[PDB]
Design a protein around this ligand. Structure first.
Ligand SMILES: OC[C@H]1O[C@H](O[C@H]2[C@H](O)[C@@H](O)[C@H](OCCCCCCC3CCCCC3)O[C@@H]2CO)[C@H](O)[C@@H](O)[C@@H]1O
Length: 265
């Protein structure tokens, strides 16, 4: 592998798309590697980590309970609802909805939770309240994945998303238990977690949320480190590439390979 920056460049030229990337020390917030870190990218499903952050802040404040059962109707469901479509009769707890959103990328679960936090405008207000003045959610699932060229809606930057994920996981803005829960939901990702582990060297920690949208948009926010520890936040977004899903996945994996190969840095 080339050095990470060189691999990222190669990825842009092979994908004919824009890559944005940041590697950040989880403990200190040190930015180690940055590429287009201040450019906008569609969040896609990665927004669901922030969403569950807002939910947990409500729980901490006594305005919400993870146990609270939410009942919903079929008319409420949107495209890709693998868990929520199974519980029309019996409902799902707020905590179950969070797990379905982060671990199983359930879109209707995400919308149900969005309802509880004041919708896209409420989640955006929450971002401002934790000092993220860049990330914005404007739409619900699934329109938020539209990824129109140049459209600022539903976007973040690698730098903002990394800083925000660090704030949610470690800054004591959330309670100890809530920080632990948000981390655990990312540890439990079923969409990409088990696949990533299958290709990581022994000893490497992974927790993640992945996202996918239109026009090539792909992304991952992750915690990664050797010695079974979450040492770094890695945020990678791709946009405006015509490439196959498989090659987008491979290119993201290649940037990861470069990070691992050149870790001691
Ligand atoms: O010397 C370091 C290591 O080099 C190789 O490991 C390879 C591994 O065999 C390959 O499968 C992976 O591909 C990359 C897999 C990454 C998967 C996605 C990563 C995510 C996580 C963070 C967010 C972005 C993407 O590269 C590493 C590093 O070369 C050797 O196989 C391994 O024995 C050795 O310990």
């Amino acid at each position: 592998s080339p050095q990470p920056l060189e691999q990222i460049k190669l990825s842009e030229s092979q994908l004919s798309g824009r890559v944005g990337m940041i590697e950040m020390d989880l403990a200190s917030g040190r930015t180690l590697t940055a590429w287009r870190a201040d450019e906008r990218f569609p969040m896609m499903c990665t927004f669901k980590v922030v969403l569950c952050g807002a939910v947990l802040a409500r729980v901490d404040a006594g305005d919400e309970q993870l146990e609270r059962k939410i009942h919903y109707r079929q008319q409420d469901l949107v495209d890709y609802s693998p868990v929520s479509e199974k519980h029309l009769a019996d409902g799902m707890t707020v905590g179950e909805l969070c797990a379905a959103a982060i671990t199983m990328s359930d879109n209707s679960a995400a919308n149900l939770l969005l309802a509880t936090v004041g919708g896209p405008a409420g989640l955006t207000a929450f971002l401002r309240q934790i000092g993220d003045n860049v990330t914005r959610l404007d739409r619900w699932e699934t329109e938020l994945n539209e990824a129109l060229p140049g459209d600022a809606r539903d976007t973040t930057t690698p730098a903002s998303m990394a800083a925000t994920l660090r704030k949610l996981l470690t800054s004591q803005r959330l309670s100890a238990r809530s920080q632990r829960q948000l981390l655990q939901w990312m540890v439990d990702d079923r969409v990409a977690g088990p696949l990533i582990r299958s290709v990581l060297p022994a000893g490497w920690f992974i927790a993640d949320k992945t996202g996918a949208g239109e026009r090539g948009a792909r992304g991952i926010v992750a915690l990664l480190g050797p010695n079974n520890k979450a040492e770094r936040i890695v945020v990678i977004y791709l946009r405006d590439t015509p490439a196959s899903m498989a090659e987008r996945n491979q290119q993201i994996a290649g940037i990861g390979a470069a990070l691992i190969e050149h870790w001691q840095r």
